[PDB]
Amino acid sequence: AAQTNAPWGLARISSTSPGTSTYYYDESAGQGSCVYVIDTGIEASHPEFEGRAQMVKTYYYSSRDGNGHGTHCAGTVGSRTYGVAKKTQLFGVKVLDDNGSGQYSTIIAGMDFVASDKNNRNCPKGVVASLSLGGGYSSSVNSAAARLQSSGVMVAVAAGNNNADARNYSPASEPSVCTVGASDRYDRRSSFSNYGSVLDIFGPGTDILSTWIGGSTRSISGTSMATPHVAGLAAYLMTLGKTTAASACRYIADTANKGDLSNIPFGTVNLLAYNNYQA
């Protein structure tokens, strides 16, 4: 398939060179897979989700996305115009309030919930989880992320927006989950993106147009926007049978565009998410 005039991030992960405007991808588009978006929620009512999004857990007086952040990430995973896995199923776990804040004990609870709740859902091509969130170092948070990975779920987490080493943030610093850095449309490391040996892969994360609450759309920036590209990609590759939940992050790194990013510090991988689709 080809999406003409796609967002630059979608075109990037299906291209070998920056500057293109078409997203090339297999028509399966993630059908049969499931991506849990652990964030401020999702506006499942958005016509861009085509009824494929549904909230399954909240920890606040409401399960609605009063922020847009979670709706923006979910649209990059699987929205029809802005997503990587356009036929995937999106589940919303609202661990963050409408300021984008959330306590560690709640985020942990959310992750434990996803490990259990995938057993209630039909996902014959596997399960992905996208955690566009984090904070200071916490081993309990890291264990939580590793528990989720070990239970059969592909975990992708943002590396952080502190332009520092991700060793000091969580769950970004958990070795067994996929930790995603951010790049821009010119293959530069995003000015804000964290770095460090704990990174596994980079995805598009500067000026990312995607869905927004109110049935709208906007462009924003962060390793929060890079994470759902890789999560979408994981789910896309899993539907195709090329990798598994346990093996996807390694697969994405093996098959990534190598050595094409600028400003990548010494010790940080130089790998850009890439779907190697050959029509």
What is the CB neighbour count within 10 angstroms for residue 204?
28
Residue type, 12: R
What was the structure determination method?
X-ray
Among the options 69, 138, 210, 221, which is catalytic?
A: 69
Residue type, 227: T
Among the options 14, 15, 39, 193, which is catalytic?
A: 39
224 carries an active-site annotation: yes
Close Cβ partners of 234 (under 8 Å, ≥ 6 residues apart): 128, 154, 156, 178, 243, 245, 248, 249, 252
16 is in an annotated binding site: yes
Among the options 15, 210, 224, 229, which is catalytic?
A: 224
> Are the C-beta atoms of residues 179 and 199 closer than 8 Å to each other?
yes
Q: Which helix (H) or strand (E) holds 181?
A: strand 178-183
What is the CB neighbour count within 10 angstroms for residue 176?
15
200 is in an annotated binding site: yes
Q: Say how far apart CA 8 and CA 19 lie, in whole Å.
A: 8
> Are the C-beta atoms of residues 88 and 52 closer than 8 Å to each other?
yes
Handedness of CA 263, 269, 275, 277 (dihedral sign): positive
Nearest to 148 by CA among 40, 239, 36: 36
**Domains and their CATH numbers in the chain:** 2-272 (3.40.50.200)
Hunting for tokens 């610093």 — which residue is that? 173
269 is in an annotated binding site: no
Nearest to 75 by CA among 121, 7, 4, 127: 7
Counting Cα atoms < 13 Å in the Cβ hemisphere of 114 gives 36
